[PDB]
From a paper:
Rieske protein PetA, one of the three subunits of the bacterial cytochrome bc1 complex, functions as an electron transfer pathway in the photosynthesis of photosynthetic bacteria as well as in the respiration of aerobic bacteria. PetA has a hydrophilic globular domain containing one Rieske-type [2Fe-2S] cluster and a single transmembrane α-helix. The globular domain is exposed on the periplasmic side of the plasma membrane. TtPetA consists of two domains, an iron-sulfur cluster-binding domain and a large domain.
The structure of the Zn-containing form of a Rieske protein, in which ZnCl2 binds in the cluster-binding site, was determined. Diffraction data of the colorless TtPetA were collected at 1.7 Å resolution. Two monomers were observed in an asymmetric unit. An MX2-type compound appeared to bind in the cluster-binding site instead of the [2Fe-2S] type iron-sulfur cluster, judging from the electron density. On the other hand, no such densities were observed in the map of data collected at 1.29 Å, where the f” value of zinc was only 0.5e−. These observations provided confirmation that the element in the cluster-binding sites was actually zinc. The zinc ion has a tetra-coordination manner with two chloride ions in addition to two cysteine residues in the cluster-binding site of Zn-TtPetA. The zinc ion of ZnCl2 interacts with Sγ of Cys124 and Cys152 with distances of 2.4 Å and 2.3 Å, respectively. Probably due to the vacancy at this position, the side chain of His155 takes a different conformation mainly by a rotation around the Cβ−Cγ bond. Accordingly, the side chain of His155 has no interactions with ZnCl2. The Zn-containing structure indicates that the conformation of the cluster binding site is already constructed and stabilized before insertion of [2Fe-2S].
Author numbering:
A (entry chain B), B (entry chain A): 49 to 194
The structure:
């Protein structure tokens, strides 16, 4: 397991830590990012996280332990590329209704800020969320829990 | 880093976990083992751990964070063999004054239960103690500290 220190992760920033050779992202989400998430539901493949791509304590609307932070494995569920981080709302290339999220440059898969995949893109499932636990308010242990 | 679960490690038992290809031992020491450690001092090369073979939080009489557990890299400082574990007091082959420890089968180096090397053996230094931290009472993370 690896410890991620988020004490300096500002609103909207993304921290990358390597675990089992995979990039694990930790994103500090703002209330605005959180407010927009449920509006994505109708356009998402698996809005309720029914597919077991996360620990049960992350099977919820924000797919996380705390709403302020998203912890997920930054590997596209299509062919394994690393998606780009696109937190800004409504960029021209992604559409005016874009509420922030991730965009994979290899085949265009889109995921929102709970790392949930949108309908009709190559990736068929939500990004994987690793087992993890907070050791304290600014430190997350990745790779294990309990 | 590697996680060591010592929740089932009984008094006097030794747990081995692999870290960076090296064997890391975690020994549950009894009050009797601990009581005998200072008696080895006069016979040890580096009783005070002056040679930097451990993190500062392990530069002490028991070369550990807590007295109940010894955490050390199980590789002899002479030529790299893995020493045998000999916790029993006074076996005939090691002498009646033996207070438990480790014995390397390749050239006879002896180390006590704080993994400190005895004088006049091939190994010249105390066994290396890796960086580590307790995540909780029965879980030690090896390879990282705070
Ligand atoms: Cl891909
Ligand atoms: Cl894709
Ligand atoms: Cl040796
Ligand atoms: Cl030896
Ligand atoms: Zn992709
Ligand atoms: Zn040896």
């Amino acid at each position: 397991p690896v410890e991620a220190d988020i004490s300096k992760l500002e609103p909207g920033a993304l921290l990358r830590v390597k675990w089992r050779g995979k990039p694990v992202w930790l994103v500090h989400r703002t209330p605005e990012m959180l407010a927009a998430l449920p509006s994505n539901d109708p356009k998402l493949v698996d809005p309720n996280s029914e597919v077991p791509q996360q620990p049960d304590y992350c099977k919820n609307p924000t797919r996380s332990i705390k709403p302020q932070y998203l912890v997920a494995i930054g590997i596209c569920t299509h062919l394994g590329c690393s998606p780009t981080y696109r937190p800004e709302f409504g960029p021209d290339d992604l559409g005016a209704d874009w509420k922030g999220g991730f965009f994979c440059p290899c085949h265009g898969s889109r995921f929102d800020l709970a790392a949930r995949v949108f309908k009709n893109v190559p990736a068929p499932t939500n990004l994987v969320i690793p087992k993890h636990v907070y050791l304290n308010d600014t430190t997350i242990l990745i790779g294990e829990d309990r």
